[PDB]
Each structure stands twice: as C-alpha cells, then as structure tokens.
Amino acid sequence: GKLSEQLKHCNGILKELLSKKHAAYAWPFYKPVDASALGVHDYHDIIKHPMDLSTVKRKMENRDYRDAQEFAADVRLMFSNCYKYNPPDHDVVAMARKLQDVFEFRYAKMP
C-alpha cells in the first residue's frame, strides 16, 4: 500500500539523509553500532534502544511507521543515543548536530 502524503515527505527526508551530499557527516549513522567491533563494551549497558538509518529505512519499506510522528521519534532517538554515550566535544557529536540540522529544517516543511 501507498504511504500517506506525510509519510511520502518523511521518505524523501530519509533518502536525503542517506545521499552523497551529506555523506561527510552522515556516514557514522548508516548502520547499527557494532559494539564489539569498535571496542565499546559498555555501549549496550548505556544505550537501551539502539537506532540507525538502515533500521529506519527497513521500517519505512515494511510499512511499520503509521504516521510522521512515529518516524521522527526514531530519527531523534538515533541522535539522542549519540549525545548520551559520547562527551559533548567529540567529533561524532559535531557530525550528529549537523545531520540533525538537515533533518529538523526539512521535517518542519511537512505538508
């Protein structure tokens, strides 16, 4: 079935977040955190609800989101996990802030 008009706008935002023009700051958010691979053995004790853009994309393809609010809560959860785990001066936090600016300004243009 066809996404609602608001969910079409959300899918457009998601495609933009995954696109080459934002890759320089978006790439850490592309796939789930692999805590063992990165050596962050406390990650799952601190972050109880992991989220990333590939998971948001699978949920949109599977029609899991029933409205725009549910989609936005997942994208914001992904940024909040980054702000919770890392110190505020970390390089990856600066990248999160820049991608979140892209997201919030386009989300605000919702039909």
Ligand X SMILES: C[C@H](O)COC[C@H](C)O
Ligand Y SMILES: C=CC[C@@H](C(=O)OC(C)(C)C)[C@@H]1N=C(c2ccc(Cl)cc2)c2cc(OC)ccc2-n2c(C)nnc21
Q: What residues line the site for ligand X (CB under 6 A)?
A: 97, 100-101, 104
Using CB under 5 A, pick the residue from 3, 23, 46, 73 that binds Cl ion.
73
* CB of 17 closer than 8 Å to CB of 59: no
* Listed ranges 1-9, 55-63, 82-90, 101-109: which one lies at the site for ligand Y (CB under 6 A): 82-90
Return the number of the residue (73 or 110) whose C-beta is nearest Cl ion. Answer: 73
With binding defined as CB under 6 A, does residue 43 bind ligand Y? yes
Using CB under 6 A, pick the residue from 64, 70, 91, 104 that binds ligand Y.
91
How many residues bind ligand Y (CB under 6 A)? The answer is 12
Binding partner at 73 among ligand Y, ligand X, Cl ion, none, C-beta below 5 to 8 Å by kind: Cl ion
Cα(7)–Cα(95) distance, integer angstroms: 26
All residues at 6 or more sequence positions from 98 whose CB lies less than 8 Å from its CB, including other chains = 25
Cα(56)–Cα(46) distance, integer angstroms: 21
Question: Minimum Å distance from CB 61 to ligand Y?
Answer: 22
CB burial readout 96-111, b (16+ within 10 A) else e:
beebbebbeeebeeee
All residues at 6 or more sequence positions from 64 whose CB lies less than 8 Å from its CB, including other chains = 58
Q: Where on the chain is the footprint of ligand Y (CB under 6 A)? A: 28-29, 33, 38-40, 43, 82, 85-86, 91-92
